[PDB]
Design a protein around this ligand. Sequence first.
Ligand SMILES: *[C@@H]1O[C@H](CO)[C@@H](O[C@@H]2O[C@H](CO)[C@@H](O)[C@H](O)[C@H]2NC(C)=O)[C@H](O)[C@H]1NC(C)=O
Ligand SMILES: *[C@@H]1O[C@H](CO)[C@@H](O[C@@H]2O[C@H](CO)[C@@H](O)[C@H](O)[C@H]2NC(C)=O)[C@H](O)[C@H]1NC(C)=O
Ligand SMILES: [Ca+2]
Lengths: 209, 211, 191, 192
Amino acid sequence: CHPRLSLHRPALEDLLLGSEANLTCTLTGLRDASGVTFTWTPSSGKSAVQGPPERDLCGCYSVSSVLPGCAEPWNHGKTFTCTAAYPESKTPLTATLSKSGNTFRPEVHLLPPPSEELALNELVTLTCLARGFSPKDVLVRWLQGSQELPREKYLTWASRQEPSQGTTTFAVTSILRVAAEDWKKGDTFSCMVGHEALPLAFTQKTIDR
Amino acid sequence: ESCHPRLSLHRPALEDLLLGSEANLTCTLTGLRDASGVTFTWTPSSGKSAVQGPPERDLCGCYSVSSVLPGCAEPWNHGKTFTCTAAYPESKTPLTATLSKSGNTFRPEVHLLPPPSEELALNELVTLTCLARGFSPKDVLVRWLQGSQELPREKYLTWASRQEPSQGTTTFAVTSILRVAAEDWKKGDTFSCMVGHEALPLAFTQKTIDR
Amino acid sequence: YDIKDLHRYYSSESFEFSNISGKVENYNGSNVVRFNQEKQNHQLFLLGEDKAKYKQGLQGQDVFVVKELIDPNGRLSTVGGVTKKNNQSSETNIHLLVNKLDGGNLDATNDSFLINKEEVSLKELDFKIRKQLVEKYGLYQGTSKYGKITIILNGGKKQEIDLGDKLQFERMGDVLNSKDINKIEVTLKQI
Amino acid sequence: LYDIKDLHRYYSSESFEFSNISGKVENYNGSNVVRFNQEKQNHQLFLLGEDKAKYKQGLQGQDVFVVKELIDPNGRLSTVGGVTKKNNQSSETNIHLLVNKLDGGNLDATNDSFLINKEEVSLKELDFKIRKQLVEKYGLYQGTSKYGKITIILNGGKKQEIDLGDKLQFERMGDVLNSKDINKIEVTLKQI
Ligand SMILES: *[C@@H]1O[C@H](CO)[C@@H](O[C@@H]2O[C@H](CO)[C@@H](O)[C@H](O)[C@H]2NC(C)=O)[C@H](O)[C@H]1NC(C)=O
Ligand SMILES: *[C@@H]1O[C@H](CO)[C@@H](O[C@@H]2O[C@H](CO)[C@@H](O)[C@H](O)[C@H]2NC(C)=O)[C@H](O)[C@H]1NC(C)=O
Ligand SMILES: [Ca+2]
């Protein structure tokens, strides 16, 4: 066992597709049970929680605190402070994070299928590459013309950091295998990347025959 | 809960197998704790004995010992099967692990892809994408070349070997990204994406591109 | 901005809603008004003059939507295009001269352009003119891409839209008013 | 259709004819190879098929016609098949090489010849050498000349055909012929 505090930025999915974009501060490693002082600072809906989750993923549970409403304060970029007070030891625990600065947008690219696949004329592969964006965090989705294809139907790698002797940037690729017909048929496909640094938070690159 | 034990036997590093001389097999544990003398027993006990390691401890406690079987590289490629059994003072009942070189494989479908129709109309750095798809186990190697020159690991990005979405046979795919100088790309030279896999006839494959 | 994407875009259907109202949320850090109209929800981004001009959301204005794209949540995002209410106090047909320049020759084609309201959105003004430049002058098609829409106001001053790439969102908020427009000239420099 | 550039690169790259090569066969990723040094280069000769049992105990000192497949991160030049007896001296003999271009509804054909250095040659050496000629003197694998079929004549005793559609099958680069048993060679380019 061993208690540690932790702060988590609001998920991009939520930041770009949810209403109640809430933030989470969480204390783990407690042997105790509760009675923990979860006091932040930006009082604009402040309403922690606990519901003691034995799911400390370890032989000794813990609890957490939420700050609903803070969907906008986050985009502005204020330094949130979640001070945690628990039994065991005195001097409480305090971790605090804010928005990330020094950001760049994704340079999306929708690559056509490999000549060789058009030959085997079976299933052509559409590759999507987003690169050069900062906040590692990014979303990627697909469309057949105007209809978003289910995630269950494509593969998206993990946003990794690229090689550069300076501006720290990340890159993400994704593969969508489509029916040979449909590609030659004519209907288009699109790659839709989401991001904080984008203007409308989403770019959409489209390619066809 | 807490530290529930898990024994796992690992295959030799594809890398070692293809480019190395001594390839080993690792048999380790997870939940188990305590006992620094509690050893495991391997099957092909051809003299070469295992080599336990530094207890090492996962967070939240739960220690984890490993046992590497040296040069067991010939037998691997030779189709033999290994068996690792660990005994601890946790359960009077031991754990057994068994592994052998995969049958029913699939050669990587390697595709070298040209720079974005736009990335070049900025004459800065063009982006070369390599995609290996539909292959046997998920163990693959990806390398980059400028003609006959192998560029360094630091000079590129290859993502993990993920599993391809499928309804039938199970295959994986991996992607790599080499950013080159538009200047070089433009002056006509070439680039290669060499891949490593155990299903590929010659162990490797090279797919080459250029304008 | 590669031909196919410009033809694509400058071809899409544009809507001209009326008497719209909204609050404004800080989506991804930018002020945007949301509103449903023809069974389709929109998400108007206020990124230019309109950002301050409409710092209090929308309460009765008209809006020119043009699909930048549709959020994976089903919300068509459009940029600017907001013009005051009680604005249909006139029509207006202004002179539109189009000049397709090729082998160094001319090919002038004095045409005409219509303005739906009194106060205009550089967005609408630009969007339509290009739509009309494609449908009748093969723009962003084959090879006609570069150009330069020029709007000429009474007095003398004149505004310019480069055809090279979509109008900047920064200026979709901009508003002109019919009456101060003498003539419009284009130059489909098909290089 | 597309691998046109690839086929070219290969069937026109620099070949190599070595001799008195000795090497203990080793195991590699489940294959039967023989590594060996020759002229600043390190080779890795893979043995697949007819040649894998013939040389169960490596290469005593035969002759090897090496063709570079690629060069792994370790500098080894992966090559396949192409070994010959050893008691291989020399038989510079010229075989008749008929090349029939079929472009259009026409057949603008021509008569040529084919040289052979060894007494015992390898289908590997034939296929390579031949196509190279078909490449240099008939622009094979260029523009649209990709498909066709090389037909060898085993002195009124058989007929060995090598499709030009793609590379020779590794399986085949282990078969050998007797330079003498050849009568004539007929190529049939199929420019579509
Ligand atoms: C964002 O945070 C809110 C609040 O912490 C979550 O919404 C709660 O959902 C439960 C569901 O039963 C309701 O009972 C509460 O009233 C909601 N809270 C409030 C005050 O809105 C919401 O789930 C979080 N969003 C996610 C899923 O990330
Ligand atoms: C067993 O194989 C592993 C995998 O190749 C070896 O671990 C590597 O050791 C090198 C240094 O010698 C490191 O650079 C790699 O990062 C290691 N890889 C791993 C496993 O993380 C290991 O040395 C081998 N041990 C024996 C007994 O041969
Ligand atoms: Ca163009």
